[PDB]
Amino acid sequence: RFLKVKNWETDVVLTDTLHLKSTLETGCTEHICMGSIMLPTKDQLFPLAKEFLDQYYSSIKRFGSKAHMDRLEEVNKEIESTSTYQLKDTELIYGAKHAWRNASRCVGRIQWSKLQVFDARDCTTAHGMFNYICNHVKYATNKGNLRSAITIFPQRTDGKHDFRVWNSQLIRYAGYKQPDGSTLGDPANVQFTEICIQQGWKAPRGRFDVLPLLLQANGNDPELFQIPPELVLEVPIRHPKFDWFKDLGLKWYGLPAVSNMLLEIGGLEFSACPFSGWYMGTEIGVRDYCDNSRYNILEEVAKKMDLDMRKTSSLWKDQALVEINIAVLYSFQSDKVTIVDHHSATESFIKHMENEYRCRGGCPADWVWIVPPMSGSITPVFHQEMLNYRLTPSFEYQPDPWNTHVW
Amino acid sequence: RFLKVKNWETDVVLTDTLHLKSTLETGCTEHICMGSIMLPVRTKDQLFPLAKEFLDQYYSSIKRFGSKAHMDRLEEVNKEIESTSTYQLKDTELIYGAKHAWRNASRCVGRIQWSKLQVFDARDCTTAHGMFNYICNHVKYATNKGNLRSAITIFPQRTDGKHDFRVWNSQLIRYAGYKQPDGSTLGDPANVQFTEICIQQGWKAPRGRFDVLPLLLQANGNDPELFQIPPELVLEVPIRHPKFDWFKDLGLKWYGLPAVSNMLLEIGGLEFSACPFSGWYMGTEIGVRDYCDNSRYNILEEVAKKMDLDMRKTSSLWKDQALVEINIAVLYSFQSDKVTIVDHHSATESFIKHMENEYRCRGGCPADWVWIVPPMSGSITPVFHQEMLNYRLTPSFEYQPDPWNTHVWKG
Ligand code: HEM
Numbered sequence: 001r002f003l004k005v006k007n008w009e010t011d012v013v014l015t016d017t018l019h020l021k022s023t024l025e026t027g028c029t030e031h032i033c034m035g036s037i038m039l040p041t042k043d044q045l046f047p048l049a050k051e052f053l054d055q056y057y058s059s060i061k062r063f064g065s066k067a068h069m070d071r072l073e074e075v076n077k078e079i080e081s082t083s084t085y086q087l088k089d090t091e092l093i094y095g096a097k098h099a100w101r102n103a104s105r106c107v108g109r110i111q112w113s114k115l116q117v118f119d120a121r122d123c124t125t126a127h128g129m130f131n132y133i134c135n136h137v138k139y140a141t142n143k144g145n146l147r148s149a150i151t152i153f154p155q156r157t158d159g160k161h162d163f164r165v166w167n168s169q170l171i172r173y174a175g176y177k178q179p180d181g182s183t184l185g186d187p188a189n190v191q192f193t194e195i196c197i198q199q200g201w202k203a204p205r206g207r208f209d210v211l212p213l214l215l216q217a218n219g220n221d222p223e224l225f226q227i228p229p230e231l232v233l234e235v236p237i238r239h240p241k242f243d244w245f246k247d248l249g250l251k252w253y254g255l256p257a258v259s260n261m262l263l264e265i266g267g268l269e270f271s272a273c274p275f276s277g278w279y280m281g282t283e284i285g286v287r288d289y290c291d292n293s294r295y296n297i298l299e300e301v302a303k304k305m306d307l308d309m310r311k312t313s314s315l316w317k318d319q320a321l322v323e324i325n326i327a328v329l330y331s332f333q334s335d336k337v338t339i340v341d342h343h344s345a346t347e348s349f350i351k352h353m354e355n356e357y358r359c360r361g362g363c364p365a366d367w368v369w370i371v372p373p374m375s376g377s378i379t380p381v382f383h384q385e386m387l388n389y390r391l392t393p394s395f396e397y398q399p400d401p402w403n404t405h406v407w
Numbered sequence: 408r409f410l411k412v413k414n415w416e417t418d419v420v421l422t423d424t425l426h427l428k429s430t431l432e433t434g435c436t437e438h439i440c441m442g443s444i445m446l447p448v449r450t451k452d453q454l455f456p457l458a459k460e461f462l463d464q465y466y467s468s469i470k471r472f473g474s475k476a477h478m479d480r481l482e483e484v485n486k487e488i489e490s491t492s493t494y495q496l497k498d499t500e501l502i503y504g505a506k507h508a509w510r511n512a513s514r515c516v517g518r519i520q521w522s523k524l525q526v527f528d529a530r531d532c533t534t535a536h537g538m539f540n541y542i543c544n545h546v547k548y549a550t551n552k553g554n555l556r557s558a559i560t561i562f563p564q565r566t567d568g569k570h571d572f573r574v575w576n577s578q579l580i581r582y583a584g585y586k587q588p589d590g591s592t593l594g595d596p597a598n599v600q601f602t603e604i605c606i607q608q609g610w611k612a613p614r615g616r617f618d619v620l621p622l623l624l625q626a627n628g629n630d631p632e633l634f635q636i637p638p639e640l641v642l643e644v645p646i647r648h649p650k651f652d653w654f655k656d657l658g659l660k661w662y663g664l665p666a667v668s669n670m671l672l673e674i675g676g677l678e679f680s681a682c683p684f685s686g687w688y689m690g691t692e693i694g695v696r697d698y699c700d701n702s703r704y705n706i707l708e709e710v711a712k713k714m715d716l717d718m719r720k721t722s723s724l725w726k727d728q729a730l731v732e733i734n735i736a737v738l739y740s741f742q743s744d745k746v747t748i749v750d751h752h753s754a755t756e757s758f759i760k761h762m763e764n765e766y767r768c769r770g771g772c773p774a775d776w777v778w779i780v781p782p783m784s785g786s787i788t789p790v791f792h793q794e795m796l797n798y799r800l801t802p803s804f805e806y807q808p809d810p811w812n813t814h815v816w817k818g
């Protein structure tokens with residue numbers, strides 16, 4: 001029942017008891033581990049609400065109090081009569097923060113309790129969604145001094161009136177297939193860009209075109225909105241040593257903001273809940289720039305560095321990778337836009353894990369995602385055993401709405 | 408039933424059926440994943456089924472399933488177990504079994520090579536001196552003056568668990584470690600405990616930074632005995648850098664032959680507690696782990712100091728810069744000395760081709776992503792982007808606890 005995790009660098013051993021509260025399935029079984037797979041009614045709703053409210057009242061040291069019992073009574077009456085219920089503001093804030101706390105793939109959770117929650121449950125139209133999202137963008141960006149935030153649109157009802165942000169992130173670049181076979185812009189976004197144009201977007205047809213928002217309110221057909229250009233903070237990428245680096249013409253945006261997940265709190269489902277923090281540098285320098293399926297820039301940089309590209313064993317890919325990641329960090333830091341390096345972020349996560357074991361009895365963590373995509377074992381998380389399990393409140397991936405939607 | 412894995416870079420999707428042949432447990436449940444946990448006497452009753460499963464697999468592989476030879480071998484083994492409580496593998500079976508234990512090793516990125524394994528049958532061995540001679544021969548054959556050849560030496564199987572053959576060393580070749588009164592460590596800090604055991608057993612320690620440890624060998628459950636591998640059989644590579652002439656004066660070297668000696672080989676329910684095996688290094692093992700782990704030789708600072716990197720803030724990525732240069736130096740040095748080594752790009756690319764082939768001909772390839780992805784430059788290797796399924800197939804290699812914890816000292 002009680003499980004131990006060992007750090008092999010320090011010999012520190014921690015005991016996990018929190019996993020006993022896990023509810024949902026991992027995808028693994030006693031016969032098969034799926035650790036590396038990316039995607040592994042009134043009757044159902046009351047136990048979910050009760051479980052949540054119990055943890056909430058426990059959190060504020062009022063478990064088994066009259067107010068605890070009265071709220072449980074209130075919620076039960078509301079579900080029986082209306083088939084759902086509404087969260088109190090205090091409950092919504094607690095829930096959003098805990099969804100982040102429970103996000104096993106997130107290295108940045110030392111920050112979990114510092115989250116600004118924007119209650120957008122009074123929103124009714126796609127134009128309303130756009131205004132809420134602009135305000136989130138401006139608040140979170142804060143002229144480069146980034147602040148974590150989430151904006152929460154109305155919860156699911158019958159499932160035919162969902163609020164959804166069609167975009168995977170609030171800010172991303174367009175991709176276009178070229179009449180010569182190559183891709184201009186971000187190849188990740190070709191399909192979404194096409195849907196945008198199909199819905200009327202006038203595409204600039206450049207390499208770094210900020211995509212418009214496609215917003216769905218109340219199960220309606222999604223609508224197109226452009227984020228005011230002056231709210232989208234971008235960083236030109238230069239290198240502190242290589243003057244030629246700026247000539248690659250690279251830039252990235254300052255605000256990482258995931259907009260396609262589903263927030264579950266107390267059995268209630270918030271299908272539009274865009275949230276934002278700040279970048280860890282490797283996301284941009286390793287994945288966005290160097291994935292073969294993305295901007296794929298390793299060859300160009302290595303050439304400009306005049307490395308021997310004839311043999312893999314010269315480690316030319318590795319040398320150029322480090323330089324790209326040095327450039328990303330330098331550029332953000334020079335322009336006073338919040339960023340964290342992978343050494344700093346992983347060190348903080350280990351401290352967060354220790355805090356969580358001490359105060360909560362554990363911390364669900366997914367090693368496959370937590371270990372950075374470069375220099376893995378020179379970061380402390382590589383050497384740390386982690387247990388992965390699912391706790392609620394939670395964030396869950398949801399499929400692209402253009403698969404599901406009927407026009 | 409069918410399980411799919413996807414490659415997120417190529418969109419190639421593969422379908423696993425081989426997982427249906429798995430019966431042993433992973434550590435994981437529907438409620439918890441233990442994929443990053445390093446560590447997640449048989450009765451007759453349990454032995455014949457295991458022997459039957461194995462022999463069925465072997466006879467299928469030689470296309471003789473259900474033959475008279477297959478049926479006669481089943482009867483022969485059944486009678487041997489009923490009568491003696493165990494059985495002996497034919498040489499052909501032992502070879503097939505050792506190759507399949509490697510093919511099945513989900514943490515091994517080098518498995519494209521699995522069918523090329525030289526098997527040394529040491530089941531006639533009776534004493535520690537006998538074990539020493541067999542291990543010396545293994546080292547010489549596998550080293551092959553730098554042109555490394557994969558091999559395994561298999562000592563007698565477990566009988567009652569009171570007469571185990573064991574190599575106490577975790578690898579045939581490793582360097583000593585010495586803890587100093589001031590808390591600093593000379594040599595490899597991973598080996599301090601074992602080094603103290605060797606000294607207690609009578610080893611005269613040179614007390615330098617790269618002293619090759621002696622072998623500590625246990626035959627037939629007896630107390631282990633110390634033996635020094637002839638120095639002329641231990642091939643080493645001094646580490647230098649192609650551009651940085653100061654790299655040589657760090658005084659680094661490493662041994663050419665990686666040889667794991669602490670694992671248990673299970674074939675058909677039989678347990679081979681002493682089965683040292685060897686291949687060749689992937690460079691990152693040495694350049695990333697052995698040299699740069701904080702708990703090992705821990706050379707990053709000294710290298711970065713000599714490179715004159717900005718060390719006041721981690722965001723200069725000085726650790727990452729020094730890491731790459733160290734790994735270039737390891738590959739360069741081995742290559743210049745004509746000692747077989749593989750870089751992480753080549754090894755992972757070959758692994759993906761191996762895995763795809765296995766899906767096509769075998770219906771699967773169990774793989775442990777946490778171990779298969781290299782400890783540097785993870786996402787610029789193709790394995791990072793490849794979904795994997797981890798499950799346990801037999802024959803297999805299993806970790807066993809260090810024998811000094813469990814040994815009954817005879818005196
Ligand atoms: C404040 C700074 C933050 C940092 C440095 C950070 C860092 C990261 C990183 C590096 C990842 C892996 C992302 C990837 O590889 O795509 C991640 C994932 C994730 N983060 Fe955090 N994060 C931060 C804030 C937040 C916030 C505010 C939330 C929610 C309120 C959050 C929830 C999540 C979730 C749910 C995932 C998994 C996403 C997915 O499945 O695609 N993070 N984070």
Ligand code: HEM
Binds near residue numbers: 517557687688692
């Ligand atoms: C021929 C070249 C080979 C290469 C490049 C190679 C590469 C590797 C690497 C990089 C690892 C992870 C090592 C670590 O992090 O400690 C590994 C693990 C492993 N290898 Fe291979 N290997 C080779 C040959 C072999 C052979 C000949 C066998 C057995 C016959 C074998 C069986 C295993 C096993 C059982 C593990 C898991 C070890 C453990 O749990 O400690 N390998 N290999």
Ligand SMILES: Cc1cc(N)nc(C[C@@H]2CNC[C@@H]2OCCNCC(F)(F)c2cccc(F)c2)c1
Binds near residue numbers: 279
């Ligand atoms: C298939 C699938 C499943 C899943 N759960 N998730 C995905 C998104 C992928 C994961 N890996 C790359 C891409 O995710 C891109 C988004 N990255 C995270 C971030 F940049 F948006 C971010 C960083 C810090 C804070 C913050 F709020 C947001 C795909």
Ligand SMILES: Cc1cc(N)nc(C[C@@H]2CNC[C@@H]2OCCNCC(F)(F)c2cccc(F)c2)c1
Binds near residue numbers: 665687692
């Ligand atoms: C706790 C625990 C469990 C486990 N299964 N295993 C360990 C050995 C660890 C794994 N990671 C570092 C160390 O293993 C060190 C040995 N590495 C493998 C090698 F170098 F010997 C080798 C390389 C290529 C071919 C070959 F035949 C041998 C510890």
Ligand SMILES: C[C@H](O)[C@H](O)[C@H]1CNc2nc(N)[nH]c(=O)c2N1
Binds near residue numbers: 036369370415791794
């Ligand atoms: C197949 C494998 O699970 C996949 O490539 C994962 C690996 N680890 C990751 N880790 C993070 N942080 N983000 C990712 O997108 C991925 N991708």
Ligand SMILES: C[C@H](O)[C@H](O)[C@H]1CNc2nc(N)[nH]c(=O)c2N1
Binds near residue numbers: 008383384445777779
């Ligand atoms: C805790 C974690 O599982 C551990 O540090 C693992 C990670 N991946 C590894 N991968 C390899 N090849 N070898 C190792 O020793 C490890 N160590």
Ligand SMILES: [Zn+2]
Binds near residue numbers: 034439441442
């Ligand atoms: Zn698992």
